[PDB]
Amino acid sequence: LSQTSIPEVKVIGYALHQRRARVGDLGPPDLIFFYCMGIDTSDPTSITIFAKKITDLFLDTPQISISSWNAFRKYDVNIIVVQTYIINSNVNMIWAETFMSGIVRDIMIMKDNRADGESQNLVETLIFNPFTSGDVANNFIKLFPLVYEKGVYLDAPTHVLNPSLTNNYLVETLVEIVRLTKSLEACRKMLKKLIEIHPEAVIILIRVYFACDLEIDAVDLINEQLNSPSSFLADTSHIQLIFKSELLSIQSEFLLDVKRDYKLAKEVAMEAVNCAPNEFKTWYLLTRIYIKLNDMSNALLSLNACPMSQVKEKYVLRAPILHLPLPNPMDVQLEQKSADPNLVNLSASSLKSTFQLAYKLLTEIVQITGWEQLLKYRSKIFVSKRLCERWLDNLFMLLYEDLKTYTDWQSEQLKLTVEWELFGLCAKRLGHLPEAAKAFQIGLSQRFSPVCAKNLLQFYIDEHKRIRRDSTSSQILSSINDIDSSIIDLVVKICCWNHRWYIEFSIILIDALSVAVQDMGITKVHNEIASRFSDPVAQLIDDNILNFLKNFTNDTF
Amino acid sequence: SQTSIPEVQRRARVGQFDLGPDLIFFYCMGIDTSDPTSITIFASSWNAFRKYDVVNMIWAETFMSGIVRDIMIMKDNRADGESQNLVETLIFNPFTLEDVANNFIKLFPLVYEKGVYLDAPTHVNPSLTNNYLVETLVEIVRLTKSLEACRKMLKKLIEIHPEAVIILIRVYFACDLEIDAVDLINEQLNSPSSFLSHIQLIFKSELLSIQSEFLLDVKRDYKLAKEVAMEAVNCAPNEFKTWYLLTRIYIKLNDMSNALLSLNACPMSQVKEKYVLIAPILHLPLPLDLEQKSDPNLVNLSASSLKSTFQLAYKLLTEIVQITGWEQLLKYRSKIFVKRLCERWLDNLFMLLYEDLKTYTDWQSEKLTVEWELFGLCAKRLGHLPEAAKAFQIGLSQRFSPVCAKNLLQFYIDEHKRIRRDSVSTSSQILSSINDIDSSIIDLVVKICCWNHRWYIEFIILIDALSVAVQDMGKVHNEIASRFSDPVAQLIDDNILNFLKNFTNDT
Amino acid sequence: SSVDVLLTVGKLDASLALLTTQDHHVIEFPTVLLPENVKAGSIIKMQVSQNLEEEKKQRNHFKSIQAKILEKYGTHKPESPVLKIVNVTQTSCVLAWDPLKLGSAKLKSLILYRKGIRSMVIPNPFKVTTTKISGLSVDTPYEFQLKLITTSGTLWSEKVILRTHKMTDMSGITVCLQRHVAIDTTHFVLIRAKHNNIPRPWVRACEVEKRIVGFYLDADQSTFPP
Amino acid sequence: VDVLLTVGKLDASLALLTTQDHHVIEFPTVLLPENVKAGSIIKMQVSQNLEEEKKQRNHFKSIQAKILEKYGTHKPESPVLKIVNVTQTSCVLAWDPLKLGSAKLKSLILYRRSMVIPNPFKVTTTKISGLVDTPYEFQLKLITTSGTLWSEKVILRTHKMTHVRGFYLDA
Amino acid sequence: ILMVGLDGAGKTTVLYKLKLGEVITTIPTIGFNVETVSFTVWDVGGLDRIRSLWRHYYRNTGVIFVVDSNDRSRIGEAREVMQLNEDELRVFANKQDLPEAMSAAEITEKLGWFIQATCATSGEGLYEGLEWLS
Amino acid sequence: MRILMVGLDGAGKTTVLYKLKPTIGFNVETVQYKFTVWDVGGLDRIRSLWRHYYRNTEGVIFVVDSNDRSRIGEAREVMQRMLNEDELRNAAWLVFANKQDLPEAMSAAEITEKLGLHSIRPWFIQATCATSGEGLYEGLEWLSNS
Ligand SMILES: Nc1nc2c(ncn2[C@@H]2O[C@H](COP(=O)(O)OP(=O)(O)NP(=O)(O)O)[C@@H](O)[C@H]2O)c(=O)[nH]1
Ligand SMILES: Nc1nc2c(ncn2[C@@H]2O[C@H](COP(=O)(O)OP(=O)(O)NP(=O)(O)O)[C@@H](O)[C@H]2O)c(=O)[nH]1
């Protein structure tokens, strides 16, 4: 946190001049020349405090004006250290909106990229922990209703075709903050006051209950909205209809992800479709039910009628053109080498939007039927038949390439680390988790690689949940402990790699380390790190992740 | 002669090739590639039928495809006055030891049945009848008036290709044989011995489209044209021309209610483009035989540079507002739209229509030659022909302009056709009015042709324009040689007058 | 053979509606074609049956229109033009033609021919059926024929020869017996609009001298038998 | 509501239906008769089915009531723990069979910081190893997905002196 | 001298009546005729096809405009062609022998310089016009 | 001489140390006899941090709760993995059977069987009582003759 881990890019005044004419989604990161995230912009005095910490860094000898943006009202807040002005496309409301939009960007940049392991394309960015920049967690809640009703301007995730007061980046950020900080009583108190003027905000309260471990309280509340005449649904015909579909979607997904119960989950999923047949999530749920119900006939039919996202994209950090201050291995050049032409040119990789989610279901279908039996189903209902939606047909071409690659690999096995990544990601796409974990584990021995580490970490998380769900005494004590140690061993390594590339915040690693914390005490985890690793490394994990769990979780442990 | 030959193999960049120009470094069109010996006399032709770059069949296809390119490059760009984007191209007259027109006919059946590979114009479901090959044929026959040559060939084609009778119908209409054509159309749509279960349905729609368009363009009679247009729609509801015709009928029938409904259900072209002419980039030899200026809201008119069916639809929209007015149009609009949903593209045209009406009114209520062009094009789009002709004439006085000249020329053509029709339904007034137009036409044809020669263009608009005078006055040659110089008159003689004198089958 | 399908109304706006079936079909359907109490999420029964009685009605209507189009346009094929002679003088001649019959031709241009296209083109073939040849020679033979150019074809025929009258032949002289001034009026024997350039009873003088012969109302003066 | 439609294009999958009011409807072929072909006139009679609506309405209420009965209404109860036997340096604690209305138990923790019970449903007894005449307190913490419930704190005093070497079998 | 006028006016007849002193059988002139009588008279065809080619002879030009007095119908056409506006150019009443021929006074009114009633066949009033031209 | 005194929690390590002179951390005191003893916490949380003190260790004092019968199996696992440590290769091994005063406490011979000390560097087990101080200095005497 000291001089190092702060990237820089060199004519004076080039920074804001390129930002000034590019004003015409959530927006760009806060420019300082380097970019930065996780700054407490709730108060101008608190900003000067941050700048104070930066100007207290200007001392000593280095070894060779921030500008936050809000999407609610498209204007740029520049503050020079004190000149403060606004760049267009009541005083308290200005700092309020820019703070909320800032927090949304800090969270959604890690949530929209959760599939890619929170990958960071922009190098010159310094990402802080937004929860430890306070209290930011509590401040977001108390400042939420003031910024509510304008959350639609933030649009919605790429998998959401029809945004609303409930489905948007603002609410998605809220439910994520409340879940991580376990601030139930704080958010519940705020939302109940919001319902009084906005009865449709009860849907948000339901999602909070599910996130804060209140299933029964949530289902009891859902039934109240979908049955009781005193609900807000029973009072337009389109604004109210999308609220009903969301409730049905939540209810159906709850029935599916947990509680098994595919039969009852199907009846709710179909009603969700009848409320919003143009929505992706409705058809996406119903397709998952059909797969779970071993009905591959209607699974292909429901997958075909499933609408795709053709315009919207995932949120990423974006003047196009470096100083890299280096803060155990961390060395040499990766890739920049030859690879199997048919292995790296896999079109099934780098799939975006709903097309990626659809491909996962397709691989889940071919896992049961097989490629030969799949063509029998395909030729039966596609060209009393219906036309294929092209994008689905393309996924079949992509599926054939992956199955061929995976089979040609396993037949041969019966390789460079990057080649192990590509095969591992290929096996993961087809749903071969243990065979992919081996590929990632082999590639982890010859070299580090972030892809292998993040994917192998998720493997242990899944292995941990599996044992707890399926559950002698001696087997449990040994299997869990071995997993927990392997989890901690991976979390430390990834966090150290993130710190090298100016990343101090990772929701994946926070959730990952939280798994061990629930098992072994908060103090035991720390000593586990300080034992296998060095003292300053354990201190790093302590500041980035462990300090959040120790205090900023509202005494969860 | 040395000049009129631009200058600047190394681009096998094929794999990604419609019709496809002949590279010689400069490009060239109108070369007789029917025979290799004839090519050596002139000293790389391309054919779209079979994608190969250049035994008798090989030279046959490359010749036919070459002629198609030479003609369709002037026909598809007819709306923009045959504008040429590529400067390094040298275009000859394709019609000028064997007449190319007659050679095209004898070589037509050998290249037939493969015309679908040439695709279709941007306003068209391509077929054996609707394609660039047939479009080129009917254009050549029309210009050269080679009726007896084409008629003999087509009659032999019907024996083995009964659907080719549609082509013969289009030829009869072009070569002044309406009665023989209508008799032939009715033969296909009524007589049990006609060739008319899936391939024929697109042919029936084309016949209905031709018949309905024939009923509309001439003979007025909008009532009978309506009954056929609706039948054409029921045969091809996904076609643009079918709905485009029906919309025109409603406008002429003063039924603006269904005119907007038919215009809304009218499908648009979202992929196909108009045919235009290797290595991204000069020597410009000017033969003997500039802007850089500024109204910001006049040049930013989105109604300009409209392409494909969107332009044709906008023309009908301006034709509707001409009768009803903007206020009455919105009453019709809000009556039948939100009911049924507007197709967005139509709604955008309303925004564009408002911009043109605003611009036109601000100009008339209230200048550089370019400003006269922009306003002139605006008035022409709204259907204010005499007000637009004035703008083009004024802008042509301060400076020469190809846009102004071509548009002012088209004005006299429309005015000429108008008088000849009105004269049917004093004598000295007619004789003088026609003569004044003919002289103005010739005066403009020579100037534009001289401008084309400067930009390496030796070749349809100008030919038809001068042909109007030829039908009126014998005299034309001496008219040009009088007002202009001898070498200039010689230029017009070679480019246009030589074609009319001989290559029109003694018309 | 009626097909009964049960559909569910998905989303519903003021214009279109989305119908969903059990076989997962999503049909875009106009709301105006739906019942009054449709709302949203309601189940409708769509009975699709073929109408054979309407097919024959449209078939009979299609054949009726095509037959009417054939009868008006593309049936009557017109028509050779009949060239005639009205009057011939010593230095001029007046030609005329029978009213041009064109059922649905339509006419493009009517051109007079005298040993080539050297002659003029008729301005109003329908309004005026007479033309006068100005420049001619005394006692000289000529021939004329009309060219009818029509968009159904070109039909020209009936060429007529004529010889201009001699000075001793006064059979072509017409004065004002005609009460009204026409095209073939040669002489005009209280202000009026009158003539553009038409030349006192002179008539007696031509009878005595046995030839055509100054007789203005401005010139000098110098007996009609009863 | 009955409307007469004309068949435009007809493919194996879809079809284009044209009205007299210039409506163009893409319609699935399988819902059309077998002898439809192309350019035919079809009669589409659309009517509302109230009894089918009432069937689905009753079905929907049946499902919603079924979900509420299975998940919800039934809540997890009290984590009551009792005292089996107390010695001088150890005591055995036990608890009544855990009753959970709905899944699932996340963790069962003893409080006196103490360890988590490995098998709460199989083994309902725990014996404190290390502890004479010293007051201690114990209480269970029931963390479920339905909520966290801790109650019934129990205090006890260890007895006084008032899976013995001299009384061994080998002594 | 440039001698022009409508077709059949008698231009060629007038020219060779002054040149050869003999009335020759004249035909429609497809081109032009130039003879020296010292008057260098340029006779150009009067047909519509050749009438346009008059502009070539306007330079360095006296103008003799022969008018067919007998032809009443084309007196309007003879007026328009004459109606003088040419910068390069900054009247013979021929066929006076014919009965229906207009008098010199009448043609002057129709045309709106010097006019002379002429007769190319007889030669009357040809030299009378030349005297004024000198 | 540097001595590392470890063992399970509640064994009586702190009691033994301050008799000669719950622990969340460690305690180091120097005791004179005729020894720099490093006492580290025995809780599961701190038990992992023992490896930091394994280096440069000359003698190891393993205090065992004789009275607590239940965790003698747990006491075995912790000791057996310490003997395999390379840092404690040449380090002496002194097992203290603490709380010998209590009735149910196991004899030194009995604990030796449970710990498996006969499978072993020099080692010795001594029955101790930190409260009374019996057999504490006796263990230090053997620890000095290493
Ligand atoms: N009666 C009569 N005929 C005359 C007189 N002058 C010329 N003509 C006749 O007019 C006719 C035309 O003669 P011409 O000189 O060729 O006229 P033009 O103006 O030269 N015709 P163009 O220029 O078109 O060839 C001849 O037949 C000639 O005999 C005249 O004084 N009296
Ligand atoms: N009866 C008896 N009790 C003893 C003896 N030695 C220690 N104790 C008791 O054992 C308990 C634990 O003492 P302590 O020294 O803290 O043990 P520890 O091993 O240091 N615990 P930790 O290391 O985990 O802090 C105290 O209550 C102490 O009185 C002994 O010899 N006899």
Ligand SMILES: [Mg+2]
């Ligand atoms: Mg002459």
Ligand SMILES: [Mg+2]
């Ligand atoms: Mg201690």
